[PDB]
Enzyme design. Structure first.
Site, short mmCIF file in Angstrom:
data_model
loop_
_atom_site.label_atom_id
_atom_site.label_comp_id
_atom_site.label_asym_id
_atom_site.label_seq_id
_atom_site.Cartn_x
_atom_site.Cartn_y
_atom_site.Cartn_z
N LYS A 148 -10.62 25.07 17.80
CA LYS A 148 -11.60 26.38 17.11
C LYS A 148 -11.87 25.80 15.93
O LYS A 148 -11.55 25.19 15.26
CB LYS A 148 -10.73 27.65 16.85
CG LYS A 148 -10.01 27.94 18.28
CD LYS A 148 -9.44 29.51 18.07
CE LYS A 148 -8.96 30.19 19.42
NZ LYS A 148 -7.65 29.67 19.91
N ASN A 149 -13.19 26.43 15.43
CA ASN A 149 -13.76 26.38 14.25
C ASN A 149 -12.89 27.13 13.13
O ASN A 149 -12.29 27.90 13.46
CB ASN A 149 -15.33 26.91 14.17
CG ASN A 149 -16.27 25.92 14.97
OD1 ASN A 149 -16.14 24.80 14.88
ND2 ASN A 149 -17.22 26.76 15.18
N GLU A 205 -14.53 10.26 16.43
CA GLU A 205 -14.25 10.18 18.07
C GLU A 205 -15.31 10.73 18.86
O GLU A 205 -15.06 11.52 19.64
CB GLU A 205 -12.97 10.13 18.55
CG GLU A 205 -11.80 8.97 17.85
CD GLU A 205 -10.35 9.61 18.09
OE1 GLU A 205 -10.01 10.41 18.67
OE2 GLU A 205 -9.41 8.41 17.09
N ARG A 225 -15.02 1.02 28.35
CA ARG A 225 -16.49 0.81 28.65
C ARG A 225 -17.42 1.79 28.30
O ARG A 225 -18.51 1.35 27.56
CB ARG A 225 -16.59 0.69 30.27
CG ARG A 225 -17.88 0.76 30.73
CD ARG A 225 -18.08 0.58 32.40
NE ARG A 225 -19.10 -0.27 32.65
CZ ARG A 225 -19.04 -1.58 32.72
NH1 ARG A 225 -17.91 -2.17 32.23
NH2 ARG A 225 -20.15 -2.38 33.16
N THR A 278 -17.09 3.86 25.69
CA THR A 278 -17.06 3.70 24.24
C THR A 278 -17.67 2.63 23.50
O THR A 278 -18.74 2.83 22.60
CB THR A 278 -15.89 3.99 23.67
OG1 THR A 278 -15.01 5.03 23.95
CG2 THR A 278 -15.66 3.98 21.91
N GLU A 320 -9.35 4.66 11.36
CA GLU A 320 -8.13 5.46 11.60
C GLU A 320 -7.32 4.68 12.69
O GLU A 320 -7.80 4.32 13.59
CB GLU A 320 -8.76 6.70 12.34
CG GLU A 320 -7.56 7.89 12.39
CD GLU A 320 -8.01 8.84 13.21
OE1 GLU A 320 -8.85 9.72 13.05
OE2 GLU A 320 -7.50 8.87 14.55
N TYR A 362 -0.81 7.93 19.23
CA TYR A 362 -1.69 8.86 19.02
C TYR A 362 -0.92 10.34 19.40
O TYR A 362 0.19 10.11 20.07
CB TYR A 362 -3.01 8.77 19.74
CG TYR A 362 -3.01 8.57 21.45
CD1 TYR A 362 -2.83 9.84 22.21
CD2 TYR A 362 -2.96 7.27 21.95
CE1 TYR A 362 -2.69 9.69 23.54
CE2 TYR A 362 -2.81 7.19 23.35
CZ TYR A 362 -2.80 8.45 23.91
OH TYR A 362 -2.91 8.27 25.38
N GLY A 408 2.16 14.65 11.60
CA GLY A 408 2.52 13.54 12.45
C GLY A 408 3.37 12.56 11.98
O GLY A 408 3.77 12.31 10.89
N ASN A 409 4.35 12.11 13.14
CA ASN A 409 5.68 11.38 12.55
C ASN A 409 5.08 10.07 12.15
O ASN A 409 6.11 9.11 11.65
CB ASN A 409 6.51 10.93 14.00
CG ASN A 409 7.24 12.40 14.46
OD1 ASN A 409 7.78 13.17 13.48
ND2 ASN A 409 7.06 12.92 15.69
C1 LIG Z 1 -18.57 26.27 15.69
O1 LIG Z 1 -19.44 26.70 15.16
C2 LIG Z 1 -20.80 26.41 15.55
C3 LIG Z 1 -21.88 26.97 14.36
O2 LIG Z 1 -21.56 28.01 13.77
C4 LIG Z 1 -21.34 27.08 16.66
O3 LIG Z 1 -22.48 26.38 17.33
C5 LIG Z 1 -20.24 26.54 17.84
O4 LIG Z 1 -20.29 27.03 19.08
C6 LIG Z 1 -18.80 26.54 17.33
N1 LIG Z 1 -17.63 25.97 18.23
C7 LIG Z 1 -16.48 26.58 18.64
C8 LIG Z 1 -15.67 25.83 19.32
O5 LIG Z 1 -16.14 27.75 18.29
CL LIG Z 2 -8.35 5.28 19.70
#
Ligand SMILES: *[C@@H]1O[C@H](CO)[C@@H](O)[C@H](O)[C@H]1NC(C)=O
Ligand SMILES: [Cl-]
Ligand SMILES: *[C@@H]1O[C@H](CO[C@@H]2O[C@@H](C)[C@@H](O)[C@@H](O)[C@@H]2O)[C@@H](O)[C@H](O)[C@H]1NC(C)=O
Ligand SMILES: *[C@@H]1O[C@H](CO)[C@@H](O)[C@H](O)[C@H]1NC(C)=O
Ligand SMILES: *[C@@H]1O[C@H](CO)[C@@H](O)[C@H](O)[C@H]1NC(C)=O
Ligand SMILES: *[C@@H]1O[C@H](CO)[C@@H](O)[C@H](O)[C@H]1NC(C)=O
Ligand SMILES: [Cl-]
Ligand SMILES: [Cl-]
Lengths: 74, 385
Positions: free
Chosen positions: B3-4, B67, B115, B117, B185, B190, B231-232
């Site tokens: 999530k943002n 990534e 491939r 990447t 990185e 991972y 992370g460990n």
């Molecule tokens: C993260 O924020 C952007 C801009 O506010 C939006 O376009 C996008 O859908 C959001 N992504 C998530 C996973 O919340």
């Molecule tokens: Cl990697």
């Protein structure tokens, strides 16, 4: 037999690495920890970090692309 | 699953001050998933950050995205290499119009070269390669969830890194020849590390071998995931205590110089005894111009004895041998240098790293499952001066 002879090439440098060749990261996700300020303010942690200077500190990771800067947030 | 989240000026100041006060150069990854309707990068949030950092006089370098080969999996958005390249060009224009117009820009922080990447990297470098100062990619040997103890000690696992580095240079040589290549990185495993493995003495075989191969193969900078964190594979644990890889890293910095040379084993079997050779670090006050630093890994289950070639066979050599503090052997979180446990003197004071001088003309003993540095004093190597 447990003796191993080495061959060396010493005529010229084969490559030149940066003085910061051994660098480190902090995962971007650490910024979601409510204790971010306490953690990176640690004098013990800064002593250890200084031991690795010169180095890059890369702030990045999966969370890089889910972080939004908010200049109104406290 | 991701999530943002928002972050504040305060968080930025915390991070910057940490770096600045520790003598580290900060590289900040910008969010590449902020997209316009036509799927261009939307730079408006980055613009806000830049203006803020400019206003504080912060000296910072930049990346854009992490990534990007996984954006589809992670966020259901697909950005091809061409477009990502164009996005980097746009970032480069914003940087050039800012108070630090000469700030550095690195990317694209791709995963290791499968491939799909490699195709993304090649298209990126064709499109955007003119504006990056170095090419960044990421590497891990294993999955943290399934790693075994034998994996961490297996030369066939260690050797796979070699083909990854070759593949990256193949892409870069075909698009931007001469551009510097960085591991942006990297670590053992991972997914946060492997527990009682990534945080132990046993983690050091992968870390020292990766450093040796990276330097030998032309990688300029290697960025260890992580200094400190969940992370460990952290260098420093939750209690702010240094783990064996920290001490290995500190010793490597003290002894190993920037000029990379080559060492190799004469015998046919070159899998388990791994050797690397650089000029000695010229900032080290104990040593002098022309000295050599050898480092070696012994993955045999017996002690090996290394003999130095003419003209170095009778030089004074300082040993710096790392072995775990018991009782947990390779799974120990504590390490000894030439028989002395490494520990902070106090919260402000690192210990000295004390050599063991060997008798001139003796072979170099390397115990089973161990790694060591050896400084060849008065080597008088002209390439090092
Ligand atoms: C993260 O924020 C952007 C801009 O506010 C939006 O376009 C996008 O859908 C959001 N992504 C998530 C996973 O919340
Ligand atoms: Cl990697
Ligand atoms: C020890 O390792 C053996 C395989 O390695 C070879 O033999 C040993 C004795 C060393 O000389 C090494 O340099 C050689 O490459 C195994 O066959 C043996 O099972 C191992 N022993 C134990 C107890 O694990
Ligand atoms: C970029 O994002 C900002 C903040 O969400 C938004 O208000 C603006 O309209 C966007 N610009 C474009 C060109 O889509
Ligand atoms: C900022 O730091 C870099 C190292 O990344 C250094 O070489 C550069 O000269 C510094 N620039 C300024 C303006 O302080
Ligand atoms: C790459 O993606 C862009 C942006 O969505 C699109 O306009 C372009 O045609 C694509 N290029 C290739 C080679 O697929
Ligand atoms: Cl692509
Ligand atoms: Cl973290």
């Amino acid at each position: 037999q447990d003796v191993v002879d080495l061959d060396f090439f010493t005529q010229e440098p084969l490559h030149l690495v940066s003085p910061s060749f051994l660098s480190v990261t902090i995962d971007a996700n650490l910024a979601t920890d409510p204790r971010f300020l306490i953690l990176l303010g640690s004098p013990k942690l800064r002593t250890l970090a200084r031991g690795l200077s010169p180095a890059y500190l890369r702030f990045g990771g999966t969370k890089t692309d889910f972080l939004i800067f908010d200049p109104k947030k406290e | 699953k991701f999530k943002n989240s928002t972050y504040s000026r305060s968080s930025v100041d915390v991070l910057y001050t940490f770096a600045n006060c520790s003598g580290l150069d900060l590289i900040f990854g910008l969010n590449a998933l902020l997209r316009t309707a036509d799927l261009q990068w939307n730079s408006s949030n980055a613009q806000l950050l830049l203006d803020y950092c400019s206003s504080k006089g912060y000296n910072i370098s930049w990346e854009l995205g992490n990534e990007p080969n996984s954006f589809l999996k992670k966020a259901d958005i697909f950005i091809n290499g061409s477009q990502l390249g164009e996005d980097f060009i746009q970032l480069h224009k914003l940087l050039r119009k800012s108070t630090f117009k000469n700030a550095k820009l690195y990317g694209p922080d791709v995963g290791q070269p499968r491939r799909k990447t490699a195709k993304m990297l090649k298209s990126f470098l064709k499109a955007g390669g003119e504006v990056i100062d170095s090419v960044t990619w990421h590497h891990y040997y294993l999955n943290g969830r399934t790693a075994t103890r034998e994996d961490f000690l297996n030369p066939d696992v260690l050797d796979i890194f070699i083909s990854s580095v070759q593949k990256v240079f193949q892409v870069v040589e075909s698009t931007r020849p001469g551009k510097k290549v960085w591991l942006g990185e990297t670590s053992s495993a991972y997914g946060g590390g492997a527990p009682l493995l990534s945080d132990t003495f046993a983690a050091g075989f992968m870390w020292l071998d990766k450093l040796g191969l990276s330097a030998r193969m032309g990688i300029e900078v290697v960025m260890r995931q992580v200094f400190f964190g969940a992370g460990n594979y952290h260098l420093v644990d939750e209690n702010f205590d240094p783990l064996p890889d920290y001490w290995l890293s500190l010793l490597f910095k003290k002894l190993v110089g920037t000029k990379v040379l080559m060492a190799s084993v004469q015998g046919s079997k070159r899998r388990k005894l791994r050797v690397y050779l650089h000029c000695t670090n010229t900032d080290n006050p104990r040593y002098k111009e022309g000295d050599l630093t050898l480092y070696a890994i012994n993955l045999h289950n017996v002690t090996k004895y290394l003999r130095l070639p003419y003209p170095f066979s009778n030089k004074q050599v300082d040993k710096y041998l790392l072995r775990p503090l018991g009782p947990h052997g390779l799974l120990s979180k504590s390490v000894q240098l030439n028989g002395l446990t490494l520990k902070m003197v106090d919260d402000q004071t690192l210990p000295p790293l004390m050599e063991k001088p060997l008798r001139p003309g003796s072979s170099l003993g390397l115990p089973a499952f161990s790694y060591s540095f050896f400084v060849i004093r008065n080597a008088k190597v002209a390439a090092c001066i």
